[PDB]
């Protein structure tokens, strides 16, 4: 319609849902009313119009006529020019103008890369016209820069974008000179700012000649760098230039002199801005957002420049610039801000690790056998023996020494410290946080260590003096104590044993004194937290100093009586830490004592653990378990074990006696709980003591089976009484809990047992007698998946010894469990997953007894396997596909030609078909690794590309009803071909032929096959539309080496691995 009448099709929208919707009804047109619109109407409506305009621009550009797109192009340019060509007009229509600018840049998106050569020229000229059009032209060049530049801005400039900067040589050069012109003359802040912001977005594309050979830098620094308004943006420019890569060592132009002049000068300017006496740590929080951003842009400048050209400033004759630049990085590093400190920390790590690796690569280490240098393993070298070496680390003496103070002060809570001061200052138990807090910790630990190595004397002096201020000279506070102690504990293994001995005696003494001196629940908790952390991180020290070991374990027991759950958690945690690392010192007769320390502990175990929660008690018994394991004297060990388990046994017998008087208490929530705690206590001590737990499991075993039976009887009655609804009631649930807990104990032991024949002879018959038929007779609501789990456990462990039992397990479990799994597509997931796992285990460790299973049942075995293959979860996808792999491989290479015949004859198609549908599916990209391996194996079974004589794995093929035509290689190839053409009908009969040929040829080389199949899949339409997971193998192969080289590096320097990362690395 006309402009005056459709104006209100929206004016009524602001001042009825009726007309509001009507304007939306006029949506699909060709913006014809838009041209007339912008000029005549009303301005809210103009906004609606421009919306329509832009939409049609992107959507309908190539389809629109070459004439009209030219029309709308000139149409927008004229209005940008109408608004921008006046001071006051620029200010009044800034909103409207911006909307337009966006429309122009979106037009530019399709036009400028097409065939608009003189755009830049036109912009530059329009700039010469007036200042206002100029400013808006800068804002347009800036928005345009976000379309062209930003896309290539995150790709780190590769060859693809590198050649772009070469072609657009002139195009960018002009924009430079336009900018240098304005910056040379302009005095309007709006204009200077817009122009500056544009320079930034074009710094990386402007030819290096104009950046360094012109006086651009000189003027950026002198005209704007010290002007508060422009300061941040100019520094961002200087950062981009200082961060520019000088790809020519000396070939095109080594700008070194330009850069040294630049950095040196900018740094002096900064010295005028930021006073020498200003506390950036204290100031920053009270500064405005602009001043804070300045501090961040400075941190970014210095780090960027040093990262890119550190040699230039390091080798300068003056050195004051190297030192003062880094001092700025230090003063900044003290500021309490996550993002800023992250910036600095990354640089710092690079710096310290490099300086260290200079020492590490000396040939002076070749004489380690005489006591010179640093043996690979660990321990910081004496600094004084390195002073007479021309080491870079000497140039940074004063800087590195201050960095140690900072790094300590900026320490973050270790994973081990299970307590935090909250927002309101209360000591609470918050275990861990986001990944970032832990990645931060890893990084800060790394710097702390390298710094310790670079000068262990300086580090020890600083930590020692700080600790003194905590004890006496009062810089005391939870924070300063925490921070210092987290640092101390984190550099563990970075000092040689001797040095560390001195230090630790001081530290542990001072801290042990602090625990008794500081009063109040909270002060006691903080100090305990710190002493626990440290001693837990220094097992090497504790081993060589029995008096210290006994003293800290005793203080641990003390902490276990604290009213703080977090403190208690840390006491048990530290206790098991030490008990595992120093187990042997608890069973031996220490020179000073009358008896082995474990005797004393076990004697008072009841008094020690009386304030502990059950989970803490479990941890306690597990630790004591390690101690017991260290007792090689089998008899002595059995007595130790008996006494340790005294209380749990007593509790157990009490429950058995009670349940004999009336079995009813078994479904009393308290009884269920108690039986649980007892079983868990056993599982804890057993998982630690290992195989020599057999006497304890032997004492309990009979009562355990009878209780399983008794609770089962009770479950029957509750169901017989009130039907299957009872299975989801409190009583039956809890009784089932008793059953599950018992099983978890026997599982724990079976996995530890070494006399596998004794387990098979004495336990297995009783266990199966008690769990199998009971599982079967139960209603679905009451069947325990833990029975499946436990079967998988005993089978995986005893393997062959369990073949004769597999038929009874199958008899009672297979059929009914299947029923639960089948009808219920989303119910009984535990049973579904564990059924699949039980079968897979039977296949892996009891293959012959698996054959005894007949066709009806065999079909379902395959059915389940394929299910797990087609599951959204990654672990179960790998699992199912893999059970298939293991199955077919077993059949082909362990059975008869007639049996394997029958099997492959009965399911080969079934398999390959499913394997194909999952492989060619748009989804399921995760299972490629096994799926490919499946395909290649299948083909090998039919036509193996190997043998000195013509060998094959399968005699005949699919039922005759399928194809009376004899032949495998033929049938296989043909049938596959058909399937292939079904996934994509665009396949030329040569493509389909080539593929199938590769399969028979590459069945020998998994990598060649897998790769060729990967490419063939990438080629097709559907697959290229959702990326490639098929590279899982290439990915893990990379990751493996990564963590392997990293472990390689870390291992070569003391402290980079927590002492708990060496126990496993050795054992």
């Amino acid at each position: 319609p006309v402009s005056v009448e459709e104006l209100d099709a929206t004016v009524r929208a602001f001042y009825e849902q009726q007309k509001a919707a009507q304007a939306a009804l006029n949506q699909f047109k060709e913006d014809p009313d838009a041209w007339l619109m912008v000029d005549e109407i009303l301005e809210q409506t103009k906004f609606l119009a421009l919306q329509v305009l832009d939409n049609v621009i992107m959507t309908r550009w190539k389809v629109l006529p070459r004439e009209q797109c030219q029309g709308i192009r000139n149409f927008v340019v004229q209005y940008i020019l109408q608004c921008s060509s006046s001071e006051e007009s620029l200010r009044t229509h800034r909103t409207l103008l911006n909307k337009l600018n966006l429309v122009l840049v979106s037009v530019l998106k399709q036009e400028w890369p097409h065939n608009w050569p003189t755009f830049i020229n036109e912009i530059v000229s329009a700039c010469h016209s007036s200042l206002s059009v100029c400013e808006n032209n800068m804002i347009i060049l800036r928005l345009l820069s976000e379309e062209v530049f930003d896309y290539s801005a995150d790709q780190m400039t590769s060859t693809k974008t590198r050649n772009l900067k070469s072609t657009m040589c002139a195009e960018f050069s002009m924009i430079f000179q336009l900018c240098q012109e304005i910056l040379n003359s302009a005095t309007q802040p709006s204009l200077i700012k817009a122009t500056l912001e544009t320079l930034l977005r074009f710094c990386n594309w402007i030819p290096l000649g104009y950046i360094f050979e012109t006086p651009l830098i000189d003027t950026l620094r002198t005209r704007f760098l010290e002007v508060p308004e422009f300061r941040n943006v100019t520094l961002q420019c200087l950062t981009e230039i200082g961060g520019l890569q000088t790809g020519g060592p000396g070939q095109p132009h080594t700008y070194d002199e330009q850069l040294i002049k630049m950095f040196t000068e900018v740094l002096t300017t900064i010295s005028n801005i930021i006073p020498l006496q200003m506390d950036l740590k204290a100031t920053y929080p009270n500064s405005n957002s602009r001043d804070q951003e300045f501090i961040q842009n400075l941190a970014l400048f210095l780090t960027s420049f040093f990262t890119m050209h550190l040699p230039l400033i390091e080798n300068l004759p003056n050195r004051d610039f190297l030192t003062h630049g880094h001092f700025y990085l230090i003063r900044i590093s003290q500021i309490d801000d996550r993002e800023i400190f992250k910036i600095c920390l990354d640089y710092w790590l690079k710096l310290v690790q490099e300086l260290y690796e200079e020492m590490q690569s000396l040939p002076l280490n070749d004489m380690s056998s005489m006591g010179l240098g640093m043996m690979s393993g660990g321990g910081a070298p004496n600094p004084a023996l390195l002073e007479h070496y021309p080491l870079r680390k000497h140039k940074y003496k004063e800087v590195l020494s201050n960095l140690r103070v900072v790094m300590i002060e900026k320490m973050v809570r270790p994973e081990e410290v299970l307590i935090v001061e909250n927002d309101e200052g209360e000591i609470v138990r918050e275990f861990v946080k986001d990944t970032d807090s832990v990645q931060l910790y890893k990084t800060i630990r790394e710097c702390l260590v390298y710094l310790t190595h670079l000068d262990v004397v300086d580090m020890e002096q600083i930590m020692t003096e700080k600790l003194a201020r905590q004890v006496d000279g009062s810089e005391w506070s939870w924070h300063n104590c925490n921070v210092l102690c987290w640092a101390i504990g984190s550099i563990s293994m970075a000092m040689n044993e001797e040095t560390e001995k001195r230090f630790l005696v001081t530290v542990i003494k001072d801290l042990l004194g602090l625990t008794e001196m500081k009063r109040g629940k909270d002060n006691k908790a903080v100090v305990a937290s710190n002493i626990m952390y440290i001693v837990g991180q220094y097992p090497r020290f504790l081993k060589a100093h029995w008096k210290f070991l006994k003293t800290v374990v005793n203080k641990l027991f003390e902490f276990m009586h604290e009213s703080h759950e977090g403190v208690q958690d840390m006491a048990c945690d530290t206790f098991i830490k030490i008990a595992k690392q120093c187990r042997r010192h608890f069973v031996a007769l220490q020179p000073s004592e009358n008896e082995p320390f474990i005797e004393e502990i076990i004697r008072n175990i009841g008094k020690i653990t009386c304030d502990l929660t059950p989970q803490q008690v479990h941890t306690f018994y597990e630790a004591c378990g390690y101690m017991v394991s260290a007792q090689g004297n089998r008899n002595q060990q059995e007595r130790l074990l008996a006494e340790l388990m005294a209380i749990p046994n007593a509790a157990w017998d009490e429950i058995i006696k009670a349940a004999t008087m009336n079995p009813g208490i078994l479904h009393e929530p308290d009884t269920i709980k108690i039986i649980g705690n007892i079983m868990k206590t056993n599982v804890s001590a057993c998982s630690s003591i290992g195989p020599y737990f057999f006497p304890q499991i032997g004492r309990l075993y009979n009562d355990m089976l009878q209780m399983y039976a008794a609770t089962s009887q009770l479950i029957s009655e509750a169901v017989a009484r009130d039907g299957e609804i009872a299975t989801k009631m409190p009583k039956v649930r809890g009784l089932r809990t008793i059953k599950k807990e018992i099983l978890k104990l026997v599982e724990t032991f079976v996995e530890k047992a070494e006399d596998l024949q004794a387990v098979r002879s004495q336990m297995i018959p009783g266990l199966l007698d008690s769990v199998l038929v009971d599982y079967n007779r139960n209603v679905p609501g009451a069947r325990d998946a833990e029975v499946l789990k436990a079967m998988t456990v005993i089978i995986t462990r005893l393997q062959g010894l369990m073949e004769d039992q597999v038929p009874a397990i199958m008899e009672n479990v297979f059929e009914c469990t299947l029923d639960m799994i089948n009808k219920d597509f989303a119910e009984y997931p535990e049973h579904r997953v564990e059924f699949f796992n039980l079968l897979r285990a039977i296949n892996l460790y009891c293959f012959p007894a698996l054959l005894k299973l007949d066709n009806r049942q065999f079909k379902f075995v395959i059915d389940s396997c394929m299910w797990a293959s087609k599951h959204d979860n990654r672990d179960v996808e790998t699992a199912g596909l893999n059970m298939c792999l293991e199955l077919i491989n077993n059949i082909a290479e362990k059975t008869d030609v007639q049996t394997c015949n029958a099997f492959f004859n009965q399911f080969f198609i079934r398999i390959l078909q499913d394997v194909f549908f999952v492989l060619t599916d748009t989804d399921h990209k995760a299972g490629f690794k096994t799926q490919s391996m499946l395909l290649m194996r299948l083909f090998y079974f039919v036509h193996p590309a190997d043998g000195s004589a013509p060998k094959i794995q399968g005699p005949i093929y699919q039922p005759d009803q399928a194809q009376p035509g004899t032949g495998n290689r033929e049938f296989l190839a043909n049938f596959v071909g058909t399937l292939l053409q079904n996934a994509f009908a665009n396949l030329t009969p040569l493509q389909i032929t080539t593929f199938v040929k590769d399969c028979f040829e590459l069945n020998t080389q998994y990598d060649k096959f897998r790769v060729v199949l990967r490419d063939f899949l990438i080629s097709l339409r559907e697959f290229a539309g959702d990326n490639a997971e098929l590279y899982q193998v290439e990915k893990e192969q990379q990751e493996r080496e990564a963590r392997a080289a990293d472990l390689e590096r870390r291992s070569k320097v003391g402290g980079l691995l927590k002492p708990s990362e060496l126990e496993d690395e050795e054992l």
Side-chain angles (χ1 to χ4, degrees), residues 187-212:
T187 74
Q188 274 183 291
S190 61
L191 175 65
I192 294 184
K193 179 174 172 57
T195 297
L196 232 28
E197 297 273 358
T198 304
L199 208 204
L200 191 159
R201 239 78 57 196
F202 285 98
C203 285
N204 305 284
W205 303 93
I206 287 167
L208 294 189
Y210 290 141
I211 299 292
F212 296 99

Side-chain angles (χ1 to χ4, degrees), residues 882-895:
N882 247 287
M883 185 202 162
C884 180
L885 202 282
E886 288 141 31
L887 216 205
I888 63 178
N889 265 292
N890 274 312
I891 287 293
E893 306 184 65
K894 288 180 180 292
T895 56

